[PDB]
Amino acid sequence: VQLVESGGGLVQPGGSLRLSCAASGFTFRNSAMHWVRQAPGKGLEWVSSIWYSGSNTYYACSVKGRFTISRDNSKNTLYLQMNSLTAEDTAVYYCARFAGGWGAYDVWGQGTLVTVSCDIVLTQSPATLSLSPGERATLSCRASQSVSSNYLAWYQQKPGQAPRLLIYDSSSRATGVPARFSGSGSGTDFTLTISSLEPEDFAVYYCHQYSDISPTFGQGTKVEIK
Amino acid sequence: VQLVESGGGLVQPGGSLRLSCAASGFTFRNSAMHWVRQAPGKGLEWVSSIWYSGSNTYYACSVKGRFTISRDNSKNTLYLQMNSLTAEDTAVYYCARFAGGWGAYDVWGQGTLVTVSCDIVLTQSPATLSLSPGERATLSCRASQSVSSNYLAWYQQKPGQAPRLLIYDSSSRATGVPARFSGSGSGTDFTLTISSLEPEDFAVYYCHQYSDISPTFGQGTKVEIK
């Protein structure tokens, strides 16, 4: 009684792969068959299920509209057709026989890895600054490698609004930006200093490097009232 | 000087939408134009870039192979064609003019929300258990609503291996599982107890409800050596 899995491998986003699972040792046509996946370092996640011709196939929302489950009972084979793949679909994929009250997922395929794949990382600190008006906020943006030509910008974002450019070229204030916003630093260490905070200044602030063709943003620092 | 965005809305996974951005106030035909997005409650993320005809278009790996950036300079309009949409593409999408060392993203569209959408949540606690051989491990699995027929299972998973069924129907220890594994509980409160831990028992353990057509797993508990 076993499920012999086949397929997988490394593809580019938008590509497609077909997985298969050959069953033996049980009456295949009577069993419901599921796909389950597990992203690297993550937990198990149901993907899709299929039972008998005329009963419903089901899909997790994560794959619905792109993946197709099917079976060929004469071949004792379960399939998963994976179309328009995304990097987020990277995972080990398992087929499993579903035994319901007689055993949940009691037979598993060995799993096959599907990897979908095609960089300056900005780390902002701290994540949150709880401060009062009149005080000074100092925001740090550290880059995993040197940011060429000080091509670093800071944006302010209020809730429900588009980002607003504050600083570009690490230290140049954009039009309309008050002197109490000050950018500085170089190489891998950049800071935004906001002196004598006003209530309007409480917002999220993102740093942005445009020193290469793969632009990156920090994860933001939220400055909030105390 | 502005970017007037339009489009967006709510679609189902695998569907498609086209966004657009009409520019005025600057020489659009010569501009570098980017799309940037922001998942709800999350940070800014570059999506795609387009510039003069003798240059290439670029895409973040998150959208490459599914999205297409384009421009119609005679209409001063930028487009993003979004195909095979995914729940993870849910985000506010911004167009922006890119000015490099003369201003980074210095003009922003106001943003439009794209939502892509179509549940018994299992909460395992604690997340990790540091124990030594001979001690007893007690693992909890809490369901957000009642698990019909107590259709709840436990799996053991070792690194590089497929999950192994231990318990189903809340308390049925599968054939071949040692008696030191014991499942109990009902309704929304389930427990796996591993008495007299042996070296082979250190692993990750998942619970799994199969009481409806949308199977779910807990996020696992790692039982690890102290």
Numbering used by the authors:
A (entry chain G), B (entry chain A): 2 to 119, 125 to 232
The authors write:
Diabodies are among the smallest of these bispecific antibodies. They are constructed by connecting heavy-chain variable fragments (VH) and light-chain variable fragments (VL) with short “GGGGS” peptide linkers. Therefore, the two VH-linker-VL chains associate to form a dimer with two antigen binding sites, each consisting of the VH and VL fragments from the different chains. In order to investigate the structural flexibility of the Fv interfaces of diabodies, we have determined the crystal structures of 10 mono- and bi-specific diabodies with and without bound antigens.
Although changing Arg83 to a threonine substantially reduces ambiguity in predicting diabody structures, they remain significantly diverse, which limits their use in designing protein nano-assemblies. In order to reduce this structural flexibility and prevent chain shuffling, we introduced disulfide bridges between the VH1 and VH2 chains in the Fv interface. The sites of the proposed cysteines were designed initially using the “Disulfide by Design” program, with the crystal structure of diabody 6052 as template. In order to examine the structural flexibility of the disulfide-bridged diabodies, we determined the structures of three of them. All were designed by the “Disulfide by Design” program using the crystal structure of the 6052 diabody as template. The three diabodies have practically identical structures regardless of large variations in the crystallization conditions. Some of them were crystallized in a buffer containing a high concentration of salt and organic solvent while others were generated in a buffer containing polyethyleneglycol. The pH of the crystallization solution ranged from 3.5 to 8.5. This demonstrates that the introduction of a disulfide bridge can essentially freeze the structure of a diabody under a wide range of experimental conditions. The disulfide bridges we introduced were located between the Fv domains and can essentially lock-in the relative conformation of the Fv domains in the diabody.
